[PDB]
Every structure is written in structure tokens, then in C-alpha cells.
Amino acid sequence: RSTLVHWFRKGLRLHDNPALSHIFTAANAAPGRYFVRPIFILDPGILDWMQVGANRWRFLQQTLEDLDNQLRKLNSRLFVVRGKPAEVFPRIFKSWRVEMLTFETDIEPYSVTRDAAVQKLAKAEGVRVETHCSHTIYNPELVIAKNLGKAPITYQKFLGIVEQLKVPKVLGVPEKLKNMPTPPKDEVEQKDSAAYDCPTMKQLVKRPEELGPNKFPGGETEALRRMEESLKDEIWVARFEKPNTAPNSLEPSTTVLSPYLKFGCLSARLFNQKLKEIIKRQPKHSQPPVSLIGQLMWREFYYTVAAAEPNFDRMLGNVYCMQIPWQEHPDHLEAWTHGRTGYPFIDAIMRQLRQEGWIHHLARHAVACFLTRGDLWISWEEGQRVFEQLLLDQDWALNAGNWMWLSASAFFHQYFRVYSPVAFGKKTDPQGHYIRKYVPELSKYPAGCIYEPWKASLVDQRAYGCVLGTDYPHRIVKHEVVHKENIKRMGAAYKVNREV
Ligand SMILES: Cc1cc2nc3c(=O)[nH]c(=O)nc-3n(C[C@H](O)[C@H](O)[C@H](O)COP(=O)(O)OP(=O)(O)OC[C@H]3O[C@@H](n4cnc5c(N)ncnc54)[C@H](O)[C@@H]3O)c2cc1C
Numbered sequence: 001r002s003t004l005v006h007w008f009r010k011g012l013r014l015h016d017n018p019a020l021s022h023i024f025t026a027a028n029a030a031p032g033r034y035f036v037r038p039i040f041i042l043d044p045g046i047l048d049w050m051q052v053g054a055n056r057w058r059f060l061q062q063t064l065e066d067l068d069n070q071l072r073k074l075n076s077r078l079f080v081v082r083g084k085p086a087e088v089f090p091r092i093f094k095s096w097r098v099e100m101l102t103f104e105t106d107i108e109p110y111s112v113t114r115d116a117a118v119q120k121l122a123k124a125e126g127v128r129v130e131t132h133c134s135h136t137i138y139n140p141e142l143v144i145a146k147n148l149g150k151a152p153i154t155y156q157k158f159l160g161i162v163e164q165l166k167v168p169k170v171l172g173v174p175e176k177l178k179n180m181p182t183p184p185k186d187e188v189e190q191k192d193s194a195a196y197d198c199p200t201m202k203q204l205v206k207r208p209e210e211l212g213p214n215k216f217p218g219g220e221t222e223a224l225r226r227m228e229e230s231l232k233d234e235i236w237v238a239r240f241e242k243p244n245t246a247p248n249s250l251e252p253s254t255t256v257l258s259p260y261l262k263f264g265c266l267s268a269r270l271f272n273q274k275l276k277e278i279i280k281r282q283p284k285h286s287q288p289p290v291s292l293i294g295q296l297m298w299r300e301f302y303y304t305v306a307a308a309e310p311n312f313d314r315m316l317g318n319v320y321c322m323q324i325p326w327q328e329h330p331d332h333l334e335a336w337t338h339g340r341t342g343y344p345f346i347d348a349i350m351r352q353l354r355q356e357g358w359i360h361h362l363a364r365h366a367v368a369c370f371l372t373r374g375d376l377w378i379s380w381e382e383g384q385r386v387f388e389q390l391l392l393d394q395d396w397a398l399n400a401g402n403w404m405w406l407s408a409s410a411f412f413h414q415y416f417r418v419y420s421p422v423a424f425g426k427k428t429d430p431q432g433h434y435i436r437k438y439v440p441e442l443s444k445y446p447a448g449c450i451y452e453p454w455k456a457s458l459v460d461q462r463a464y465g466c467v468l469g470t471d472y473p474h475r476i477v478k479h480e481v482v483h484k485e486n487i488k489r490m491g492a493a494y495k496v497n498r499e500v
Pocket of ligand 1: 242253254255256257258259261262292295296298299300302359360361362364365368387391393394395396398399400402403406
């Protein structure tokens with residue numbers, strides 16, 4: 001008896017999962033011949049390549065637990081294998097007598113390298129590998145081909161391409177396993193009945209004092225519930241305009257499906273199909289790019305450009321990226337990282353980010369403009385790295401693409417438009433309720449200066465019980481000075497890159 005193995009990495013879901021579905025149908029169309037091992041590999045190697053913060057570790061823990069629970073309902077289970085894939089797969093290929101391996105493809109460079117090696121091993125041992133592109137709606141390889149070998153570098157051009165492509169068939173959940181025994185314990189399982197169980201919170205989360213509020217539980221079950229909750233107001237969905245949603249409402253102004261899509265707890269193909277059903281129903285609706293479907297297409301766009309460039313997450317060697325002489329300022333980077341800039345709106349966002357692991361799109365705009373071309377003149381690569389640690393939705397291509405946009409390094413070139421760290425949040429939150437919540441030390445400042453506490457006299461600062469320089473920092477830069485200097489720096493960068 002040989003085993004069929006599905007390998008979860010992303011695609012942490014049962015629904016709309018062709019790679020996992022195929023494994024399950026095969027076992028049921030040939031009972032008695034196959035064992036089924038759906039595995040996730042706790043790969044130590046990823047930690048040398050990316051930073052994971054406490055909150056995102058908790059999201060994965062909750063996700064793996066839900067995926068185990070969901071598989072049990074199909075008379076299977078999740079097998080979480082500790083160790084490096086390069087060492088893990090030669091062993092299990094033999095100890096399990098693996099006939100077929102399936103997994104959802106990914107475009108990240110670490111994923112490509114790792115998968116190429118695993119496919120070289122599987123070819124050696126006579127293991128059949130079947131891979132499926134289901135993490136994105138469209139296959140970036142097919143988009144690039146249809147555009148004659150180059151990723152479209154504007155959104156509109158991208159949309160004109162994918163409109164001519166076939167939308168994939170969205171699958172349901174696999175059928176339960178008919179009369180399948182629990183595979184026999186292997187070398188590892190015999191010396192430890194729990195060697196493959198889902199990791200506890202204590203095993204994944206080493207810095208539990210950094211966990212924030214548990215607001216967005218991981219797992220396919222929660223993703224599907226939140227998706228259904230979001231689609232309940234069909235008018236809100238159909239008439240959604242991303243630029244008009246507030247960055248500083250106390251409750252999120254968008255779906256917060258991003259962590260779920262990032263891990264594949266939610267199929268973006270399923271979500272796209274649910275959105276198209278509502279739009280068909282609602283004749284007055286918004287259109288890309290501002291619509292909710294447009295938001296899914298931004299994800300597809302950044303995946304397509306990123307698939308073409310292995311250096312997508314850095315400035316050097318990145319075909320898309322303007323070469324800009326970013327400066328090193330450790331003390332300013334530290335203040336931004338920890339929300340101690342002295343600009344209450346910026347600091348509020350970075351504290352929401354650290355505590356909760358999600359901030360609104362235009363909140364990301366605000367703090368990203370501030371760190372880079374706006375105020376501090378620090379590389380977007382430094383902001384990407386903080387975002388990588390703290391975001392639940394941390395996504396290699398999306399973090400990089402948007403950081404390049406926000407820094408005027410690619411895709412976006414109107415760098416003379418600069419967000420004010422004082423005025424920007426006032427439009428949607430004139431009272432500063434958001435600031436009061438996430439910078440509570442300012443909670444007694446009135447609306448007239450809560451965005452600009454340095455406009456309060458010392459006497460008043462003492463009255464509000466928050467003296468700048470003691471209880472809340474002084475501004476680390478003066479926006480009105482630096483952003484003008486930085487516009488001139490950007491123009492000189494643009495000239496140098498234009499001449500080369
Ligand atoms: C500096 C910066 C860094 C970012 N890093 C990430 C990241 O690491 N991971 C991430 O998922 N998004 C990232 N984004 C994009 C965007 O901010 C988030 O996708 C969005 O805020 C998630 O909130 P939501 O789920 O309510 O989105 P909604 O507005 O509800 O949109 C639904 C989905 O569309 C996608 N989406 C929306 N806006 C964008 C966008 N601008 N680009 C790409 N996809 C988009 C996501 O899949 C999102 O879940 C970043 C943006 C900026 C400016």
C-alpha cells in the first residue's frame with residue numbers, strides 16, 4: 001500500500017483546492033490501495049528568509065488547528081512534519097511509499113527554489129508530482145505569455161490582458177474518505193505518537209508578551225464566516241470604492257480578508273465568484289480599480305509583476321525599481337518602527353499595526369510615505385521588513401509592490417503629491433478618536449490640536465497630563481521642512497535614472 005501526499009504551504013483550506021481534491025478523489029476511486037497524508041512542513045529555513053511576529057505566529061497556529069479539524073471531518077487529519085523539506089522528503093518518500101505528491105504552486109523565489117529541488121527528488125524516486133495554480137485567480141505565467149513575455153506594468157494594461165483569459169472552475173470541498181485506515185506509524189511516529197500533531201500556541205509563539213488582541217482568528221472556517229459576513233450588505237459590496245473607505249475608523253472600513261487570502265484560508269477564486277454574483281444582481285456598482293473586484297485584481301497585478309522579478313523585494317537588481325539614494329538613520333527608523341515619531345497620526349497607525357497586525361490600506365500609505373519619500377528618506381526595504389514582521393497579511397509580492405508604489409520607486413511616479421501626517425487623517429476622523437485609542441497618552445487633547453500636540457502651550461500640555469518630550473515624544477522631523485527637501489531629492493534621483 002502506497003501513500004498519496006498533499007503538501008500544504010499556502011492554500012491552507014479544504015475548499016477550491018484542486019491539488020488536495022485530486023488526492024482525495026484518487027483514494028476514493030481506488031479504495032484499499034492508498035494511504036493519504038496531508039502534510040504541512042514546519043520548515044526552519046523560512047526563518048532565515050523572513051521575519052514572523054508573534055501575532056502572525058498565532059494566526060498560523062489557529063489556521064493549522066482549523067485545517068486539522070476540517071480534515072478530521074473527512075476521515076483524515078493534518079500531519080505537521082518538523083524539519084527542512086530537503087531532508088524531510090527523501091525520508092517520507094521511502095518510509096511512506098509515496099506514489100503521488102500534489103501542491104499549490106507559489107511564485108515566491110524561496111518557493112520556486114524549494115519546489116524545484118523537491119521536484120528533482122520526486123523525479124528521482126519515481127514520485128508523480130501534480131501542481132495546481134489556485135493561489136491566484138490567474139496564472140502569472142499565462143498573463144506574461146499573453147503579453148508577449150513581459151508583465152504588464154500598469155493596472156489598466158493588466159486588466160485588458162486578464163479579461164481575455166478563462167476564469168477557472170471553482171471547486172467545492174473534497175468528498176470524505178471512504179473506508180480509509182489511519183496510516184501505519186513510521187519511524188518518527190513510533191518513538192512519539194504526537195510527532196506530527198498541530199503545534200500548540202506555546203510551541204510556535206516564543207514571545208507571547210507581544211501577542212495583541214485576538215481579533216482575526218486564523219483558519220478557513222473563520223475566513224469563510226468573515227467572507228459571508230462581508231457579502232451580507234450587497235449594496236456596500238456592489239458600491240464599494242476603496243479610495244473612499246476610512247483609514248482611521250475604529251472598526252475596519254474594508255473586509256480584512258487579507259490575512260485569509262494571504263495564507264489561502266480563503267480562495268481568491270471563490271471570493272471573486274461570490275463578488276461577481278452580487279455585481280450581476282446589483283446594476284449600480286463600482287468598477288475597477290476602486291471596486292472590491294478591483295481590489296482582487298490589484299493582488300493579481302502585483303503577483304504577476306513579482307513572478308517576473310526574483311529581486312522584487314529589493315532595490316538593487318530589480319528591473320522595475322528606480323534607484324534612489326536612501327539614507328541610513330537608525331534612530332529615525334527605530335522611532336517609526338515603534339510609533340514614537342511625535343506625529344500622533346503616524347504613531348497611532350504603527351501602534352495599531354504592532355498590536356493588531358492589520359491596518360487599513362490608506363493607513364499603510366500614510367506611514368509608508370512618511371518613512372520613505374515623504375519625511376524620513378529611509379529605504380522602503382526597511383519599511384517592508386517591519387511590515388513583514390507585524391502584518392497578519394504579510395505577502396511577499398504585495399508588501400514589496402505597494403512599498404515600491406508608496407515610495408515612488410515603481411508603478412507610481414507623482415512624487416510631488418505628499419501625504420501630510422497632520423492633515424491626512426483629519427478628513428475622516430476630525431475628532432481623533434483613532435488617535436485617542438492607540439495613543440491614549442494624548443487622550444485629553446482637544447480635537448483642535450490632537451493631531452498637532454506641539455501647538456498646545458506647556459500649561460495646557462500639563463493640564464492634559466501629557467508633556468511633549470516626557471510623556472509623548474517631540475516630532476523627530478518637521479514635515480514642512482523635510483518633505484520639500486525630499487521632493488528635490490526625488491527629482492534628482494529621477495533625473496539620474498532617466499539618464500542611465
Ligand atoms: C506599504 C503597503 C504594504 C502592503 N502590504 C500588504 C501585504 O503585505 N499583504 C497584503 O495582503 N496587502 C498588502 N498591502 C495592500 C493593502 O493595503 C491590503 O491588501 C489591504 O489593506 C488589506 O485590507 P482588506 O483585506 O480590508 O482589503 P480590501 O479593500 O477589503 O480588499 C480585499 C482584498 O484585495 C486585496 N487588495 C486590496 N488592496 C490591495 C492592494 N493595494 N494591493 C494588492 N492587493 C490588494 C487583498 O487580497 C485584500 O484582502 C499593502 C499596501 C501598502 C500600501
